[PDB]
């Protein structure tokens, strides 16, 4: 159905995302159990890590377009990522490496992320009808990798330890590189312009130098979230000032702030919703015992099922509005499950969490699948930088919000943790419902401005 390079890109992306989500799924627990962080420390450090992972995506597209070439930067990004995963595995011998290792993942992700999609875009003549389907399959590829990693990495970490888990993340990147190299022959005429001139070693060195500096800056920021806060605050207020000085951009701005709320909520899945599953949900479904950390896999699961269907099935501000209502319902369901449908011992049915994750995934399919894609319909470089910046700010904020559910390590009674989770998830759901209502009210004005 698709060009041959489509399938190479499908599987390269699958394996890269497998490595990344293998880390994401276990990181907060790794912080708590292996490094002895409190749940509060773990949640804010995860927020800082995710913020860097996302905020740096803007750099790799520029590097791929204008410095080294799309295909070259795919290779470089994959190699830096694999190095980062093996460094995380080494951090169990050398704990002092951990932040540098996470910084290497962040930078590797920053270099890599934008480039497979760009490459896939060049596999099709410009108005090919199959593009839409191909990008939906591309999204499924992401979520297939994520589904496997989030399912299996906690199980592996429980049975063999974190060193093996992280080394397997590295191995997944290694085989992403091998399939790229083996299929390199399929994309000989595909690339950005620098791909077809010989590589500038001047620019390669600038990219390696900047990458290394960035790895150390990321390590520092993740270690000192209290100044990462001020960096992103001053960066946000400043870029806000310079956006306000410089009416379709007004639509881009309002949609960007709503996306901020969405990413704040997405950030709860590896932190507060993860520990809610650990502490207040039964760890058995359909008669099988499972690792509760594996519940994070319900996000890619539902996406994998719903992306074809919803591809088969208003317009922009209303699609955003619908997604915000979905997210609101995910957190209201979590709160309701804890308030009314828990056991005498404080444990709730995992079917409630299956439904929580359905709501959050539908929100994702309406909002983030369709965010900078049709923010690109309103618009340049300034807004790409600000988009990734604001989503980074969202992840920092999300870590902070998660800290309201943090549980001291001496608590052992689920009836003590249940009201903390229910209070916070209920308040998140109510605030997000209000945000959805203000969104609904502005949908007509937004839809006019888009004309």
């Amino acid at each position, epitope marked *: 159905q698709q060009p041959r390079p489509f399938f190479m890109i499908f599987f390269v992306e699958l394996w890269e995302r497998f490595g990344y989500y293998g880390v994401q799924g276990v990181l907060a627990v790794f912080f708590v159990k292996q490094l002895g962080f409190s749940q509060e420390q773990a949640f804010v450090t995860f927020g800082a890590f995710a913020a860097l992972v996302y905020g740096l995506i803007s750099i790799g597209g520029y590097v791929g377009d204008h410095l080294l070439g799309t295909k070259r930067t795919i290779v470089l990004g994959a190699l830096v990522l694999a190095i980062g995963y093996f460094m995380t595995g080494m951090s169990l011998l050398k704990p002092d490496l951990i932040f540098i290792a996470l910084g290497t993942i962040a930078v590797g992700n920053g270099l890599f992320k934008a480039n497979p999609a760009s490459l896939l875009s060049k596999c099709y003549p410009p108005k090919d009808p199959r593009l839409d389907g191909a990008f939906t399959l591309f999204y499924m590829s992401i979520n297939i990798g994520s589904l496997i990693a989030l399912s299996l990495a906690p199980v592996i970490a*429980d049975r063999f330890g974190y060193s093996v888990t992280y080394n397997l993340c590295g191995a997944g990147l290694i085989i992403a590189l091998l399939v790229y190299i083996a299929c390199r022959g399929m994309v000989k005429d595909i690339g950005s312009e620098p791909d077809f001139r010989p590589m500038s070693f001047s620019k390669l060195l600038y990219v390696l130098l900047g990458s290394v500096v960035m790895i150390f800056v990321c390590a520092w920021l993740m270690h000192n979230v209290e100044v990462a806060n001020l960096v992103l605050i001053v960066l946000s207020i400043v870029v806000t000032i310079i956006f306000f000085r410089q009416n379709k951009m007004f639509v881009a701005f309002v949609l960007m702030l709503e996306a901020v709320v969405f990413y704040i909520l997405y950030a709860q899945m590896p932190t507060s919703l993860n520990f809610f599953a650990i502490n207040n949900v039964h*760890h058995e479904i359909l008669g099988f015992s499972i690792n509760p950390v594996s519940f994070q896999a319900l996000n890619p699961f539902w996406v994998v099922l719903a992306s074809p269907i919803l591809a088969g099935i208003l317009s922009m501000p209303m699609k955003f509005t619908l997604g915000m209502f979905m997210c609101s319902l995910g957190f209201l369901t979590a709160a309701a499950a804890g308030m009314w449908f828990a056991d005498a011992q404080g444990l709730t049915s995992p079917w409630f969490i299956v439904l929580v994750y359905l709501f959050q995934s539908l929100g994702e399919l309406f909002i983030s699948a369709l965010g900078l894609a049709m923010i690109a319909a309103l618009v340049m470089g300034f807004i790409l930088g600000m988009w990734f910046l604001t989503q980074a700010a969202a992840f920092l904020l999300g870590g902070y919000v998660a800290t309201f559910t943090a549980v001291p390590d001496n608590i052992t009674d*689920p009836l003590e943790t249940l009201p903390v989770y229910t209070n916070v998830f209920g308040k998140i759901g109510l605030v997000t419902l209000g945000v959805a209502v203000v969104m609904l009210l502005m949908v007509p004005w937004l839809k006019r401005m888009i004309a």
Partner: nanobody, 122 residues
């Protein structure tokens, strides 16, 4: 996923016994281990436990007599039973649940040892 209990037995009132729980494949370090006991003609009841990060929980009638502790080198959890009394006679089970919580009912725990008879004679 399968726990081995060891260390039960017969003891006189006022004596002591030590139970131990060890896991096979999975590292017990990620698990809250609760000790349950079933006396003749009653249901399994929570006795004592330790979560994955040294939090402790106890039934009222064993406070000041039982101690749960954890040896993370041997990947073993221990229940040290002092000042034993006849009504402590029961089959004892260790049970393991991932994470920091020690729920009170058997249904909160997926993994179970086979049970060790503890008898306290007057």
């Amino acid at each position: 996923v399968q726990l081995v209990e060891s260390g039960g037995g017969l003891v006189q009132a006022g004596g002591s016994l030590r139970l131990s729980c060890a896991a096979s494949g999975p590292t017990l370090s990620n698990y809250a281990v609760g000790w349950f006991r079933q006396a003749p003609g009653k249901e399994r009841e929570f006795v004592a436990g330790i979560n994955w990060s040294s939090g402790l929980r106890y039934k009222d009638v064993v406070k000041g007599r039982f101690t749960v502790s954890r040896d993370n080198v041997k990947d073993t959890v221990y229940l040290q039973m002092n000042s034993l009394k006849p009504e402590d006679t029961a089959v004892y089970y260790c049970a393991a649940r991932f994470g920091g919580m020690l729920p009170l009912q058997p249904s909160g725990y997926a993994n179970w040892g086979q049970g060790t008879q503890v008898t306290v004679s007057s």
